[PDB]
């Protein structure tokens, strides 16, 4: 039994997008299906259920904008989204409800891996990278990755060489852009003596900035 959703991507506020959920390993038509979303904040929210017989139930805030439909001959569940807005940003999950019309039982027993949907006015942008050097047994250094889009960014220290003592913080969205920082701790007898560089890589733009961390007086 498998559910595979597709169609996710970046859309402008007010735009439209259609998601697909391909089912396999079970008689699609004998089950109710549902789409559930998980917001960036990690909150789970039910969006719509369509019963095996075809009864449809929607969340009030999408009624009139989202249309669910199913193609029983092809084992596919759809979600046509329109007049999208920022609040629609989330990971969309396709889920099977162990229910057929009339049954006293219903619960989500099978979930897809989810497809991501981002509603925003923004263009693929490289991040500005800034070295963080201090102005002790060990020394902590960092890299500030500011103003980039979209997610994600990759941060390494000395090409994976430095793996332990590293802390990469999750990106925060501010003023429509993401900011991330990363720290690394090393023995005071390692830097400045030996070099220390944070390797920043923004897959989207194939960007690869190497920022050497040099000692500096503020």
């Amino acid at each position: 039994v498998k559910l595979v959703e597709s169609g996710g991507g970046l859309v402008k506020p007010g735009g439209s997008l259609k998601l697909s959920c391909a089912a396999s390993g079970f008689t699609f038509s004998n089950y109710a299906m549902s789409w559930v979303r998980q917001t960036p904040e990690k909150r789970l929210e039910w969006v719509v259920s369509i019963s095996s017989g075809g009864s449809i139930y929607y969340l009030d805030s999408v009624k009139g904008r989202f249309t669910v439909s199913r193609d029983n001959a092809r084992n596919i569940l759809y979600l046509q989204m329109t007049s999208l807005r920022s609040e629609d940003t989330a990971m969309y999950f396709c889920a099977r409800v162990s229910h057929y019309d009339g049954s006293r039982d219903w619960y989500f027993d099978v979930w897809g891996a989810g497809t991501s949907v981002t509603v925003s006015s923004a263009k693929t942008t490289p991040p500005s990278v800034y070295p963080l050097a201090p102005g002790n047994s060990m020394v902590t250094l960092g890299c500030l990755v500011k103003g980039y889009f979209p997610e994600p960014v990759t941060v390494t220290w000395n090409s994976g060489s430095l793996s332990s003592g590293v802390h990469t913080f999750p990106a925060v969205l501010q003023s429509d852009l993401y900011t991330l920082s990363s720290s690394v701790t090393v023995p005071s007898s390692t830097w400045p003596s030996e070099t220390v560089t944070c390797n920043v890589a923004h897959p989207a733009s194939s960007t690869k900035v190497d920022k050497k961390i040099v000692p500096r007086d503020c």
Binding site: F108, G135, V172
Partner: protein, 219 residues
């Protein structure tokens, strides 16, 4: 709609302990057909939710004996007799009796460890950024426990909230500690108008707030 409330938000347990999670609904969850559709899910990082308990107390197939559910009307509980490593994650309760079906906010199960004081570090803005007109002062507070920590920024003695951006990591799989980043961003212009930039954190491991300062006239 029916509001589902979970308590606690985070639950520190030691491996082998017994965990109990509460879930309260704003109204009765009993359906007109006499049944109660209260379900429980476990979500581990990078995976989608997984059904554990359906209709208050039935275990879904493949779900170990250690999990049990009970409750009625508006109060329900999930209990894990013996917490194993594979049980770490975020548990969600859900009511499917009424439209719209709704989920509780979630309860994160974390590992308990000894209290540890944060190692604080402050960084002045780099010359590269100042060349752009911007000036971010960064504060790292690493490897502390518990997660509860309060960080305030003070410039020449006055608290500042505008232009502060905080990010917290999840529990470290190795030492079970938490780390936090706090960035005060201002303009090169205002930055050069002040002298004392202070990052101060209050944590249970210390009576005095933990302070770290940078003075532009001692560089």
């Amino acid at each position: 709609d029916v509001l589902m409330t979970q308590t606690p938000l985070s639950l520190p347990v030691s491996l082998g302990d017994q965990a109990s999670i509460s879930c309260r609904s704003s109204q009765t969850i009993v359906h007109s057909n006499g049944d109660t559709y209260l379900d429980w899910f476990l979500q581990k990082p990078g995976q989608s939710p997984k059904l554990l308990i359906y209709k208050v107390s039935n275990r879904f197939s493949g779900v170990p004996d250690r999990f049990s559910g009970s409750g009625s009307g508006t109060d329900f509980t999930l209990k894990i007799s013996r917490v194993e490593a594979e049980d770490l994650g975020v548990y969600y309760c859900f009511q499917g009796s009424h439209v719209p079906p709704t989920f509780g906010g979630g309860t994160k199960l974390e590992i308990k460890r000894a209290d540890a004081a944060p190692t604080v570090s402050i960084f002045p803005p780099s010359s590269e950024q100042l060349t752009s007109g911007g000036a971010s002062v960064v504060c790292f507070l690493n490897n502390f426990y518990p997660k509860d920590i309060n960080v305030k920024w003070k410039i020449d003695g006055s608290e500042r909230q505008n232009g502060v951006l905080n990010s917290w990591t999840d529990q470290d799989s190795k030492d079970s500690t938490y780390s936090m980043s706090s960035t005060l961003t201002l303009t090169k212009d205002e930055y050069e108008r002040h002298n004392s930039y202070t990052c101060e954190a209050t944590h249970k491991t210390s009576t005095s707030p933990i302070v770290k300062s940078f003075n532009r006239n001692e560089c």
